[PDB]
Subunit: 114 residues, 4 copies
Amino acid sequence: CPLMVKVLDAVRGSPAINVAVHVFRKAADDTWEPFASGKTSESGELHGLTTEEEFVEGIYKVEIDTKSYWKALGISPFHEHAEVVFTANDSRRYTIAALLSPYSYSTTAVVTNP
Amino acid sequence: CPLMVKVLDAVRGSPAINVAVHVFRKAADDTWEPFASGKTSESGELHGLTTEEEFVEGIYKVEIDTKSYWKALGISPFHEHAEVVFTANDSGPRRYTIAALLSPYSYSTTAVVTNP
Amino acid sequence: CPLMVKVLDAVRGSPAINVAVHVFRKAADDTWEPFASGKTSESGELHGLTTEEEFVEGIYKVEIDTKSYWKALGISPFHEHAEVVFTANDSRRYTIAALLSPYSYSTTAVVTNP
Amino acid sequence: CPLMVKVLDAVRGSPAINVAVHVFRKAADDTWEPFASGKTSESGELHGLTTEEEFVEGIYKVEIDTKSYWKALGISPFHEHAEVVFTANDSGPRRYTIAALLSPYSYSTTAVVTNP
Ligand SMILES: Cc1cc(OCC(=O)O)cc(C)c1Cc1ccc(O)c(Cc2ccccc2)c1
Ligand SMILES: Cc1cc(OCC(=O)O)cc(C)c1Cc1ccc(O)c(Cc2ccccc2)c1
């Protein structure tokens, strides 16, 4: 699929499982419209968010509900969520990886050619 | 000061200089209200965004304009910005440092929260 | 396999391909002895480093030749290499992930139960 | 001072305090010679490790004792330490800040290199 999300937990050294993830596309009036969502699997992965036909060029936001995830582990977190905003440009499979800690997160993009 | 932002460049091993930073606060009607903004200095620091009086409890969004930064350097980066969103001062006033590390296709953000 | 290495490139947004990786186990006299090595694949992965029988408890070092990798891209790097040192403890597949930038690197461990 | 180390804790959103740091320099015979060592302060900073005179060209290793840090907090971390290895002063004297961010199963390290 053209867009995949992979989330890891830096405290336990494991995939971040059952993390809610919502994806939005920016519309003509500059608001975010829901596009896709899911929960990460047992391997911290979220596949089948979209298809090639639907994933057109545009500005996308991937919002990862980190706060609910830490709350379920009984750990006080800093961030309300993690939000990754990017332009999808035709020329390409996107993997958005995120590494979570209660007071920090990192995100990287892996952009590859089939 | 109660809120400070520090930005580094992981390609150039230097502070990220002249990076625009915009801070918003969630209003009663659930919309983002403009709160303060500024530019990182030669040391990659942004001080003086706010005051103890003005920086009340709330949900804040710190948006770091990573894209314009990379573009001025001739790089086409992945992200539009780096965005940090947090509830501030929920148990009384704290001092927040938002530290960000930038690469063209990655960023990290961390918070240092201390009680004066 | 019990030990896997995955390396990403934060400058290009891609797997880090053809990165030399050497693994060492700490011996009784506190020196590092070569244990395994390889180069990352087209997907930035290095599999088949060791087997369950051979990967006993001990202190391991994973040395990732980041400097040669940046040099091949024509980019000046800071670090001589990236070196991840850990205790492998029985109770477990280890993924060591690393995210590379010329002046920074991060590494995380994903430790999972088959 | 020419070499400074700054350490943060990503679990506690605070400086990493009382972290041991050992610095070595590669000798002529290719072995690591002890160069300087110290403990991070209440701000997670380690200053005064060396001087401009003493900090000559060479390959240096900065070893941050992350394991003892986590253990004193009751965590069993993954890594034995965080180790940064770099050629220093190859085009003349520079000032180096080694910044590290710590989680039990992860760490990041970055370098800020400036020309006084
Ligand atoms: C907050 C701060 C105080 C500080 O005081 C030292 C000084 O400059 O005198 C120095 C620095 C480089 C910093 C910023 C800083 C420290 C560690 C660090 O890892 C980072 C960048 C970072 C940001 C997110 C994830 C990993 C790294 C910045
Ligand atoms: C481990 C892995 C598995 C994976 O699925 C395939 C597999 O499990 O073999 C896909 C990816 C991109 C990865 C690597 C990865 C996942 C999350 C993540 O945040 C990072 C980057 C990172 C690495 C170290 C420190 C901070 C951030 C890499």
